[PDB]
């Protein structure tokens, strides 16, 4: 039974980066998966990606180079007040020097950094480094 489409797509992704694969077919997909990809791409990890419209959910091909050391989802999507940021960046990320924890906020989906600059927080999605 499918729970958490972000989780499917993220794990399948990491797997293919790990196998040295040059691209990934990703199915099925959501807004959140595409915004997460738009985020990783904007941030330098994945490359160009293409969305495929089958009349239903969708498919997504992702050009990867190789950068991603890991990209995960956290489930459940916990509540992350601004106070708790320290915790999550220390627990999840490889080092202070890089890597992101992505969150949903009422201001939208953000690098935890974008959250300090937007001064908000509260819903954790996943991470990549």
């Amino acid at each position: 039974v499918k729970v958490n489409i972000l989780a499917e797509c993220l794990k399948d992704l990491v797997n293919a980066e790990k196998m040295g694969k040059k691209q990934v077919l990703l199915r099925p997909v959501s807004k959140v998966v595409l915004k997460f990809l738009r985020i990783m791409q904007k941030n330098g990890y994945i490359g160009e990606f293409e969305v495929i419209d089958d009349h239903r959910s969708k498919k997504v091909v992702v050009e990867l180079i190789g950068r991603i050391n890991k990209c995960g989802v956290i489930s459940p999507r916990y509540d992350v007040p601004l106070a708790d940021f320290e915790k999550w960046t220390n627990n999840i990320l490889p080092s202070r020097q890089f890597g992101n924890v992505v969150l949903t906020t009422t201001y939208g989906i953000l690098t935890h950094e974008e959250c300090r600059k937007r001064h908000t927080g509260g819903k954790i999605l996943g991470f990549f480094y």
Binding site: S75, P76, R77, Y78, D79
Partner: protein, 140 residues
């Protein structure tokens, strides 16, 4: 998988599950039901008692010697207790029916070394220390 719920409404099941499994941890168990209070010391650190018997106890294998001991009647409990008498010829500092101060052997309820099953040691005789007496600081 992991056989363990992850979900944000899962809180009580998680915490209850621990409140259960916690019982398999021994120190928790022994703590939680009074176990301490029922032991011959009644939870206490030391105890005073009377000496019923001076008794030799043959050591566990592979050691041979005669461990000098005493059976004491604890004044608080009126329980009978088998206690070891430390160092050398200290069994002599003891007379039958004295007041005696007794403590654990350091395993908290269990016997140490070659003395089988004996969980306690002698500390004071009448009022004085076995140490004080041994080194001959005071006299009985």
């Amino acid at each position: 998988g992991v056989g363990k719920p992850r979900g944000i409404r899962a809180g009580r099941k998680l915490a209850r599950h621990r409140k259960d499994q916690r019982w398999a941890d021994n120190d928790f168990n022994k703590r939680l039901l009074g176990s301490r209070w029922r032991n011959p010391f009644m939870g206490a650190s030391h105890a005073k008692g009377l000496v019923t018997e001076k008794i030799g106890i043959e050591s566990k294998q592979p050691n041979s010697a005669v461990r000098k001991c005493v059976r004491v009647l604890l004044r608080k409990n009126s329980k009978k207790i088998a206690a070891f008498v430390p160092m050398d010829g200290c069994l002599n500092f003891l007379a039958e029916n004295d007041e005696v101060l007794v403590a654990g052997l350091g395993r908290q309820g269990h016997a140490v070394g070659d003395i089988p099953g004996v969980r306690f040691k002698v500390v004071c005789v009448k009022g004085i220390s076995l140490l004080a007496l041994f080194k001959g600081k005071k006299e009985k």
